Each structure stands twice: as structure tokens, then as C-alpha cells.
Amino acid sequence: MKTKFYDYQGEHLILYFAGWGTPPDAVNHLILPENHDLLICYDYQDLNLDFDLSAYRHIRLVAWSMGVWVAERVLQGIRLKSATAVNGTGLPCDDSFGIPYAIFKGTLENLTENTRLKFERRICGDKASFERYQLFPARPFDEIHQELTALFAMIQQDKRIDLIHWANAWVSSRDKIFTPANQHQYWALRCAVQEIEGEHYVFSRFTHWSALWD
Numbered sequence: 093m094k095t096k097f098y099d100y101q102g103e104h105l106i107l108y109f110a111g112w113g114t115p116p117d118a119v120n121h122l123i124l125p126e127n128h129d130l131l132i133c134y135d136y137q138d139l140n141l142d143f144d145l146s147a148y149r150h151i152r153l154v155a156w157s158m159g160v161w162v163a164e165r166v167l168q169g170i171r172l173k174s175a176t177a178v179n180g181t182g183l184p185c186d187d188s189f190g191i192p193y194a195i196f197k198g199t200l201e202n203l204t205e206n207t208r209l210k211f212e213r214r215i216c217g218d219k220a221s222f223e224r225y226q227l228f229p230a231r232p233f234d235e236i237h238q239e240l241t242a243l244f245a246m247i248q249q250d251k252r253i254d255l256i257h258w259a260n261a262w263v264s265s266r267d268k269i270f271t272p273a274n275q276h277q278y279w280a281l282r283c284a285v286q287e288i289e290g291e292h293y294v295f296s297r298f299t300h301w302s303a304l305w306d
Contacts, residue, residue, distance in 0.1 A: 094135040102128040105148040109159030110134035113236035115228035164255035177261035181278040182253040217291035258283040
């Protein structure tokens with residue numbers, strides 16, 4: 093996969109796993125706590141993370157949407173100080189715990205540049221939110237089509253759960269991708285759930301990374 097590394101010479105690391113096809117800049121505005129680096133992970137063509145995690149003390153994981161399922165694969169076995177899910181579950185292609193199968197299939201089979209914009213509208217909910225989101229650099233279409241293809245295959249092949257331990261999960265009240273009912277159903281007995289009013293993209297309600305985990 094791809095990475096963007098922000099080097100603050102920190103002893104600790106923030107690991108952020110993006111949603112499918114989403115711009116890394118979606119979290120650009122978030123302020124880091126002192127003594128922390130940030131590594132943005134995205135473009136899940138594969139599950140390979142070419143980054144040395146070995147020298148860091150604490151690692152704070154934040155994962156959005158399909159990034160949750162991915163993070164469970166990539167960080168299985170790695171000691172994390174905390175792991176935070178944001179609008180995503182361990183079962184991302186699931187009628188009851190994630191995105192329903194027919195929707196996952198239909199999104200991929202009908203993906204064009206036009207329908208990509210339609211999906212982003214649903215990520216954002218309202219027009220105002222959508223128009224602000226469109227100020228972010230758009231990743232190339234061929235890249236995100238290849239990414240959804242690999243994700244849909246791997247998720248179908250690999251239905252394991254609880255590969256890492258989650259400390260908390262944020263659930264948006266009006267999430268149209270991972271519905272709140274499906275999120276609550278997955279996280280209820282796993283971790284602490286913070287309910288927030290908003291949509292699938294909810295990082296415009298945050299100014300500081302640390303507010304996501306504390």
C-alpha cells in the first residue's frame with residue numbers, strides 16, 4: 093500500500109488507515125500531540141506496509157471505514173497503545189455488520205468517475221459537506237478502481253475477525269456507507285462506542301488527533 097509520513101522526530105506514532113479511495117488530505121487539518129509522528133496509510137492494492145515501526149514506543153491506531161478491516165490484517169501482532177475505529181467494522185462486506193454485499197458488488201461493477209462522485213456525496217451526506225470535500229486532491233480513477241477490486245476480493249476471501257483489540261469506536265448518526273445500526277451491532281460487546289452526529293466522513297468535527305482516542 094501507499095504511505096505519507098510526517099516526521100516530527102516523535103517517540104510515538106499515529107497510524108491512520110484511510111477509507112477506500114479517500115484523499116489522505118482528509119485528515120490534513122488534525123493537530124498532532126507533541127512527540128508524535130504521523131503515518132497515513134492508503135491505496136489498499138495489497139496489505140504490504142513498507143515502514144519500520146520498530147523504534148516507536150507507543151503506537152496510536154486510527155482507522156476509517158474499510159481501513160478498519162485492513163488495519164486488523166496489517167497490525168496483527170503489533171503492540172498498540174490504543175486502536176480507534178471510525179465508521180468501520182471488522183466485517184466490511186456484511187448485510188448486518190458492514191456494507192451490504194449487493195451494495196459492495198454494485199459499487200464496484202458500476203464504478204465510473206461519475207458514480208465515484210455519487211459515492212463521495214453519500215460519504216459526505218449533504219451538499220455543503222460534499223463541496224468542501226471536493227477541495228481535497230482526488231486520487232486517480234484507475235488507482236481507486238484497482239483498490240476497490242483488490243479490497244472486494246480480499247474481504248470476500250478473508251472473513252476472520254478480532255485480529256486486533258479495539259479500544260474505542262466512533263459511530264456517525266447518519267452514516268450512509270456503514271449504517272449506524274450495523275456499526276453498533278459489531279462494536280456493542282467489543283469496545284467503547286462514542287456516538288457522534290454526522291456522516292461517514294466526520295473528521296471535520298475534529299481538530300486534534302488525540303480527541304479521537306482520549
